[PDB]
Amino acid sequence: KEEWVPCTKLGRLVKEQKITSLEEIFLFSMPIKEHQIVDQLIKESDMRDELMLIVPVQKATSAGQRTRFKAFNIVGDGNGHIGVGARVGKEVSLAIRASMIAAKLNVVPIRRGYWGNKIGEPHTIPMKVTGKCGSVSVRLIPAPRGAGIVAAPVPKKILEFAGVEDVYTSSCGNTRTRGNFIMATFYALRKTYGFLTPDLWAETEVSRDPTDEHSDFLTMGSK
Amino acid sequence: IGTYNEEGVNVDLYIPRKCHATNNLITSYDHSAVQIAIANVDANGVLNGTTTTFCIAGYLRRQAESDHAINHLAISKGIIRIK
Amino acid sequence: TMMSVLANALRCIASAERRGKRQVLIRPSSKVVVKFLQVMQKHGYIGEFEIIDDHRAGKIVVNLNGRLNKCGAICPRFDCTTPDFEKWVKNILPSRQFGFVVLTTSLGIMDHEEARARNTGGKVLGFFY
Amino acid sequence: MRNYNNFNRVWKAPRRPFEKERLDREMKLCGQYGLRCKREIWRVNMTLSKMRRTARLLLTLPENHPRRQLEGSAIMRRCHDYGFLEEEKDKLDYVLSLTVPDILERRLQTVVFKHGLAKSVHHARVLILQRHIAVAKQIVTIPSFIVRVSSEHHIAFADASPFG
Amino acid sequence: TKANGQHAARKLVRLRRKNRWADKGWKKSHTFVAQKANPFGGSSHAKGIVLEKIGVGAKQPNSAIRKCVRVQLIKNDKKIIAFVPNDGCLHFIEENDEVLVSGFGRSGHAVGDIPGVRFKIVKVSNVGLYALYRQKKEKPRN
RNA sequence: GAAGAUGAUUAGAGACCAUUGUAGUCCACACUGCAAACGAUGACACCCAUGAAUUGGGGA
RNA sequence: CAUCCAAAAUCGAGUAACAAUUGGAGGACAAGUCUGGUGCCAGCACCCGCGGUAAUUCCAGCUCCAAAAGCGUAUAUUAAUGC
């Protein structure tokens, strides 16, 4: 792109070789405020960007009416990183460009476990999870190997992104409003790490934030 | 620690942090889950350097249970004195 | 009134756990409620518990380490069997890996895992994650 | 009346036939491997789903169960034959990693071409049906004949053949 | 809600048996008034003798004229209307010709822009009417 | 004060309004059981936090 | 059905005339920024909707799509339905 100037601590570190992966940023909870943080760390040839929806919205005005376009982006790596944008712009290309920014901010990692057969690398979600936006709520159920992605084409996409290849699913409520279904499905795949399991606990040690360690070089950064 | 294979090899992207107070997994998503680092002190008021660490969850600032738990954590490690 | 002793106990535990509280009180006591707690304390989900004596009915008190996520009760005590371990373990639990259903048998009170091992089914009791 | 011979379907059409995702992954096969029509792609799908059903059911079971023991060895044995899986496989999770191409690949039509006895799959389908191929010494004029791992190395030609 | 007791069974059963009578997708099967009402007797098709050609209007949003046929049913001696479902094939139906009659689409609601008519004429004199339309066969007057 | 009567209002008006007036409005003994009979929230039981009051009893 | 066109002796494709059809192409739903004709008429349309001379839906041609020696239509029944 055009030449870039970080206004973020993280941004500086990422432009240097200090933070070299998403993991570091995630592990000590910090918000991503610049999409350029994603592009630098995760190289292109792993990232994919699809537009799940583009639709007109209308706002009422006396006589003629102004119009706009909502759209969704979806983004991520098949290595277990996903992130869903949605944004609004008064023209087509506007809302498109805007979506992809927001999407790369909202990126979250994915835990994949097993069904109770352990071979290779994860093919299955570690547990049942649910996510809800509007009246729709999705129930992701873990499936045995070779099941394939058993869901509708709308979530099939969203699951392919997140590296889940074996699942069984069902939805509830009004599912024929597209937008609500997307957000729902995504909140599901978050909830994995949000749930405490015996395998994880051992009172795993914490250490200093990248920010703190690199404080000196951020001071120098400011200059 | 973490998910393993039958070959014993870790499959996880990361192993999330512990909130010492509730022993629950701090998510990446929670940005209210703050890591408080206090610097220890010895005789003659010399800092040992930052050694100890606490981690608080983002579910403890939605009703401000934070203060309460920090005290029970601290007092147990002899950091805060009680009579 | 209460028509299941278990239901009265394990809705105090679940609620308390969702609030992160590190001890809970339990109003009644039974021989049954003891055994249920015992299981989970071995597998590491409870620190300790005390039974206190009022010489009418006891008041259990438990120390939560926050390692639980739910403790349920299967109220009608439906019949599960050697094949039908599979059925329950899928349907009410989020996993087959760390889901624990607890059952009653003539032998005693035990996990499904140990039930299969000794090859006796029975009527279900409760469950936890 | 008094007929005691069974009928069964061997092929079925997947739900929602106008999915443009499914269409891609159909044509890709049927053109490449020279298949007549979509019916063939489905025929293998059925038999694969079948196999994968029992394998799933076995996998569920605790160790040292009779269903697990007996019928486990059988499923594995018949994927060693036909060369779908190798003899380093035993899990009954390997069996669930089988997909549609690995079946089609071992049909006579493709095996003929791949062994160097034709110049295309289309061309090898003719070579079969003009009665000028064999599978050891037995003339087979069916392109959907699945060829053993042993007997794909003894294909030769028919003894009725002007090309042999 | 519901009852979870061990001997609760009979209350459950009797509850369902009551509440299925609030379903119209139960009635439509089990009740023989529905069968009786249907002009074919619930059979796939029936035959009838053409009485009269009846021009039928259309509803307000789509103004058109529709060609329909007043037919009498041999089986039950009921009268019915049906639509001619091809362009310019009113000709190929004439009075007192035997004719077959079918349902069309949704069979509990009348088709749009033709009120009261769920019935389309497939075959005239056992000849396929489609065959006459897109020429293959010619109508017998034989 | 329904009904009814009379005067207005109005294009039309027992109308809404004004002056009247019967049943009814009250009580006793019989019926009726039809309300937005609403908190549109069935009954019993357990767990569940923040602050300042009120209504009864008891305690220092 | 199979095996064969001599074992001494027995047939035969090149437009390979030995020539594949039935339903679709606005949305749902795979496939037309087409060309002529019709102009709220004729008709299409399970449903949403098309047609008032500027028709992506009608009536024709070409083009392309799905299934295929099978493909449409009707009615019942089951799945879809945690209606």
UniProtKB/TrEMBL annotation, chain A:
Residues 47-110 form the S5 DRBM domain. GO terms for biological process: translation. The keyword Ribosomal protein applies. Keywords: Ribonucleoprotein, Ribosomal protein. One of its GO terms (cellular component) is cytosolic small ribosomal subunit. One of its GO terms (molecular function) is RNA binding. Belongs to the universal ribosomal protein uS5 family. This is Small ribosomal subunit protein uS5.
Automatic annotation (TrEMBL), chain C:
Pfam families: Ribosomal_S8 (PF00410). This is 40S ribosomal protein S15a, putative. GO terms for cellular component: ribonucleoprotein complex; ribosome. GO terms for molecular function: structural constituent of ribosome. InterPro entries: Ribosomal_uS8, Ribosomal_uS8_CS, Ribosomal_uS8_sf. It comes from the Eukaryota. Keywords: Ribonucleoprotein, Ribosomal protein. GO terms for biological process: translation. Belongs to the universal ribosomal protein uS8 family.
TrEMBL record, chain D:
Residues 106-164 form the RNA-binding S4 domain. GO terms for molecular function: rRNA binding; structural constituent of ribosome. It comes from the Eukaryota. InterPro entries: Ribosomal_uS4, Ribosomal_uS4_CS, Ribosomal_uS4_euk/arc, Ribosomal_uS4_N, S4_RNA-bd, S4_RNA-bd_sf. GO terms for cellular component: cytosolic small ribosomal subunit. Signal peptide: none annotated. Belongs to the universal ribosomal protein uS4 family. This is Small ribosomal subunit protein uS4.
Automatic annotation (TrEMBL), chain E:
The keyword DNA repair does not apply. GO terms for cellular component: small ribosomal subunit. InterPro entries: NA-bd_OB-fold, Ribosomal_uS12, Ribosomal_uS12_euk/arc. Keywords: Ribonucleoprotein, Ribosomal protein. One of its GO terms (biological process) is translation. CDD domains: Ribosomal_S23. Pfam families: Ribosom_S12_S23 (PF00164). GO terms for molecular function: structural constituent of ribosome. The keyword Disulfide bond does not apply. PANTHER family: 30S RIBOSOMAL PROTEIN S12 FAMILY MEMBER. Belongs to the universal ribosomal protein uS12 family. This is 40S ribosomal protein S23, putative. It comes from Trypanosoma cruzi (strain CL Brener).
